[PDB]
Design a protein around this ligand. Structure first.
Ligand SMILES: C[C@@H](C(=O)O)C(=O)SCCNC(=O)CCNC(=O)[C@H](O)C(C)(C)COP(=O)(O)OP(=O)(O)OC[C@H]1O[C@@H](n2cnc3c(N)ncnc32)[C@H](O)[C@@H]1OP(=O)(O)O
Ligand SMILES: C[C@@H](C(=O)O)C(=O)SCCNC(=O)CCNC(=O)[C@H](O)C(C)(C)COP(=O)(O)OP(=O)(O)OC[C@H]1O[C@@H](n2cnc3c(N)ncnc32)[C@H](O)[C@@H]1OP(=O)(O)O
Ligand SMILES: CC(C(=O)O)C(=O)O
Ligand SMILES: CC(C(=O)O)C(=O)O
Lengths: 516, 174, 513
């Protein structure tokens, strides 16, 4: 320690700079050469300029076995603290791959947990950049325990403050479960994630796969259903993170602050021409979405997974809303195992954070297929019914076209708590297709007709007109009104405004039993 | 596992774990099938559970699969290790090849160095005594006393009252 | 160590190892402990808890510190034995420092084991008992050891008023370590134990004063002078008996009332109560004789028996129900309340309220002790503690005025305006704002200008200071025959056993310091 306070202050500055240098210039250059920002550049780019207030820059591991007693591990490989994003206080962590491969030391995990506990205590969002080789091997069960504390912390925060994970490098092994326990994962194209690597896999099963094939961003998005956004690079991941956060409240006791409201709810007659009267013809439901949300702006979640169903954040009159819509242009809009998970997770998340849910319905049923049954469509489809039945935020449903049997119920009708349900003139709410229905209740009557063809068509038409028109759905009270498609935005906006004061509660329970 | 754990928790039924797990099953389809989000359900269910949680480690207890079987960090109220318990971040051999890679390649007798380091790692971390040393287990027990240890733990925690942060519900993995 | 080759061999190795751990610091150090008239850490837990009920946690737990020799030091259980057991079938959690292990110095891991045990006690709603025998925070561990104490104190406060915490000092307790016992509810010290914030070595070096550990912080010093402890024990055996006796009056946690114990449902008259209190205000007596004749079987555990003896606080039972008794002791300092007695009563009253123990006071107080040092010592703020404690208390409060009850000292003994649910006056009850002499000397100052005072004093005394006037104003519910005391108290306690009093929402009030 220098002799004067001024000398000690200069000494402090020098010591701090060494820590901020992390793994040294060569490793930093290697990181950059791989197209990756460093741990500190990431926080610096994510957070409002100069708002980062760091905790534990000088924190050190206490482990001593296998070289650790002499190892110099800056900030133990993770930079943690608080800052702001567009003025909103947040807590964040950023793993430093240049320090022991970003391996998760016991103290590093402790720093992370402490940061998470602060976010919970103060009720602010928590964002984490992952770039690591997994638990620090030199520390054995000590680093293992660190992961145990982190996972438990992710669950503690679940549904209390939003948690966002950005995978910007490797994420090898069980470390991957932390991102899984957060609410949203944004993965860059330079990242790789998996529970078991390519090598161990080959040595155990003989299967040959590259890291990119096994756990690159595209694999996780389209195949595994593990992530929510694919980012080109760190700059894009940082932009996506801020855009995502803009739709969320700071915590579960608040509704998200309104942003750039468009209070116009004028009709738009073009909406009448997006959905074809010919039921065998499709369209992109996002064309409908674009016409009804503020400025046509929306942030699609899991855009590249189970594209037969669309989940996206958007706004109506400045208010954040979560939209769930069937995509008739993909698999005829059928719901399936994967779309069921995608929808349920989004519904459950919006509910925990007071975000209204808007449904756009055009579904003919669940996807037929032996593997859908063998894959457990019964238990997966049930997740949609469970998520909507449990949700208490305002639920607004617009039936665009087909709304068949259970799949219609899975899209939240009044029986599952929709607060307002509107039917377009093309709405076709049915227990099942008129053709299949007739073929069951009028089999013999059609048989003994000597001309079942003209008989079939008659009974089929009779069934269709008796139940499947929007007027019958309206006659039964299943929809509030049959509306002009051009008025969709105003109808939704009006319903959101009236239910903005909705106060609904559920029976006392630790929790329901969410399907697995 | 997760469904059973959530159910027991909902209806106040204590959870007893018997552990002997070497890790998650290797395989492309396991990754492609979303083992990350499915495995997370066990960590979620146990971490959210507030009923008494008692865990007995019989043998293998490796990495994330061990945590998934409810260790102290996920709220286990009592944890016991049999003398055969092998709680470890990973197998001594697998570890050695990663952190001693250099020292082995440069040793006069590489094979002897590897066996030496593997032995070192095994004894430094992977024995019931180190787990107990670190407090990851309440005690190392004679397998013969398992029923008694579980019974007494259940009895003392019959009055467990544990609270959770206020929330409509968490975000259970799908 | 390296594991054996078979399961049978490993079970044997396990028994061997556990045997080593349990030997603590070794035979010599164990013999030394014994030669000093002290039991070991494990012996104390074995004598306190029911036979074979001790379920130990952390026997194989080890410190992780490596500086200054710790890397090579073998320290069994890091110096503390922790776990759960039962006392009279009641689940409890306990800790016991092993002085034979590095002088019982509080290692970081040791304090961590203690905190974990305390958290379990809180989590399961059970009492926590701790045997202290230590040289204080382990010096070789520096700030790591310091942090452990911080965690311990925070925990003592977390459990405070939720589950009973009993500390037993059975040897040294050097330094701030002592703040843990202060934060528990009751401290029991043996005659072999010592406790102090600053030790004789430092005190001598800094102040030039050379005193012994025993003169500075021995049990008698803490009991009679400091006012830091609640029970003095001859040795470990008696401390353990005291711990059990103490616990028998307490519930498992703050959500329950203590379980009734060996109830005496008889409440017939006892004329022996009429004679204990002399009609001559100049003659004193031991108020405990009154207590003895009111409580079941005359049994009572007196708290702080050797401190501020001008006031008595003791647990007892009425019809098997635990109650706290607060009584003025006329045979000491005329029964005056003072700085030290205010503290003694307040702490007791507050503790009883936190654990749903009804409070019974026997009143015979002439006022607060006159004296410059009393004013200078803050009698105003220390005395306020009694008024605060009783005013805040929501448990049933039953008061019996035996003889004198003057001004503020009477309010401090909880009258109806302080929320007493039932107040009874004996026929010798003398409730007054102030003595009739000094009162006369004020309101008749002029009209007396001699011997005129005689008539005025008399007149004042009769206009206000009689049991019937107090009753006339409703300050006491009835004037009673001292032989019926036990019955009136019993009936009162029975009726108010279902009392549910509301209090304004607040984190906490401002308890005088
Ligand atoms: C619990 C659990 C579990 O999964 O269940 C655990 O976490 S067992 C976890 C086991 N974790 C792992 O097996 C994975 C580790 N190794 C890797 O796959 C790879 O390292 C990788 C994909 C992260 C990195 O590839 P890369 O080529 O970019 O790089 P490098 O090999 O240079 O590595 C970065 C440097 O960090 C070190 N390094 C990487 N991971 C670890 C770790 N977990 N513990 C200690 N050191 C580590 C490397 O040894 C190397 O050291 P130096 O400069 O000295 O050469
Ligand atoms: C925070 C804080 C504070 O209070 O503010 C701290 O706690 S500073 C705390 C500083 N702590 C202390 O100053 C107190 C110091 N030590 C003592 O006063 C005394 O030891 C005593 C009254 C407890 C016991 O006296 P004794 O003669 O019976 O015995 P001994 O000398 O044999 O000692 C028992 C053995 O335990 C060791 N020993 C005792 N206390 C400590 C301690 N705090 N840290 C580390 N080792 C300790 C002694 O070095 C000794 O070692 P061996 O067999 O090898 O000789
Ligand atoms: C096998 C493995 C584990 O450990 C991994 O990281 O691939
Ligand atoms: C060192 C010391 C102080 O504190 C003591 O115990 O005297």
């Amino acid at each position: 320690l220098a002799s004067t306070m001024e000398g000690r202050v200069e000494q402090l500055a020098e010591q701090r700079q060494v820590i901020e240098a992390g793994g040294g210039e060569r490793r930093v250059e290697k990181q950059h050469s791989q197209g990756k920002q460093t741990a500190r550049e990431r926080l610096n780019n994510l957070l409002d300029p100069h708002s980062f207030d760091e905790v534990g820059a000088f924190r050190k591991h206490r482990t001593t076995l296998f070289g650790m007693d002499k190892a110099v591990v800056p900030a133990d490989g993770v930079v943690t603290g608080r800052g702001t994003i567009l003025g909103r206080p947040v807590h964040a962590a950023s793993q430093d791959f240049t320090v022991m491969g970003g391996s998760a030391g016991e103290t590093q995990s402790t720093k992370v947990v402490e940061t998470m506990e602060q976010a919970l205590l103060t009720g602010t969002p928590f964002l984490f950049f992952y770039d690591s080789g997994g638990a620090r091997i030199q520390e054995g069960i000590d680093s293992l325990s660190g992961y145990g504390k982190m996972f438990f912390a992710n669950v503690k925060l679940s549904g209390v403050v939003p948690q966002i994970a950005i995978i910007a490098g490797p994420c090898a092994g069980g470390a991957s479960y932390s991102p899984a326990l957060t609410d949203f994962i944004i993965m860059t194209k330079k990242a790789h994630m998996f529970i078991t690597g390519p090598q161990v896999i080959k040595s155990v099963t003989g299967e040959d796969v590259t890291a990119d094939e096994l756990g690159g961003a595209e694999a996780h998005m389209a195949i595994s259903g593990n992530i929510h956004f694919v980012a080109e690079d760190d700059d894009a991941a940082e932009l996506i993170a801020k855009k995502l956060l803009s739709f969320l409240p700071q915590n579960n006791t608040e509704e998200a602050s309104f942003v750039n409201p468009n209070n116009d709810v004028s009709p738009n007659t073009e909406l009448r021409d997006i959905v074809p009267i010919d039921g065998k013809k499709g369209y992109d439901v996002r064309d409908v979405i674009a016409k009804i949300v503020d400025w046509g702006d929306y942030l699609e979640v899991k855009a590249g997974y189970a594209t037969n169903l669309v989940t996206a954040f958007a706004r109506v009159n400045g208010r954040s809303v979560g939209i769930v819509a069937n995509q008739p242009s993909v698999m005829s809009g059928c719901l399936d195992i994967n779309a069921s998970d995608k929808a349920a997770e989004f519904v459950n998340f919006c509910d925990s954070f007071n975000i209204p849910l808007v449904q756009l319905v055009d579904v003919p049923g669940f996807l037929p297929g032996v593997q859908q049954e063998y894959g457990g469509i019964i238990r997966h489809g049930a997740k949609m019914l469970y998520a909507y039945s449990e949700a208490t935020v305002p639920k607004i449903t617009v039936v665009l076209r087909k709304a068949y049997g259970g799949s219609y119920l899975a899209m939240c009708n009044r029986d599952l708590g929709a607060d307002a349900v509107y039917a377009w003139p093309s709405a076709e709410i049915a227990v099942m297709g008129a053709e299949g229905a007739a073929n069951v209740i009028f089999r013999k009557e059609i048989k003994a007709a000597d001309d079942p063809d003209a008989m079939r068509a008659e009974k089929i038409e009779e069934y269709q007109n008796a139940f499947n028109t929007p007027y019958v759905a309206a006659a039964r009270g299943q929809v509030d009104d049959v509306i002009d498609p051009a008025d969709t935005r105003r109808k939704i906006a009006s319903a959101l405004e009236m239910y903005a004061t909705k106060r609904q509660t559920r029976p006392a329970k630790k929790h329901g039993n969410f399907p697995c």
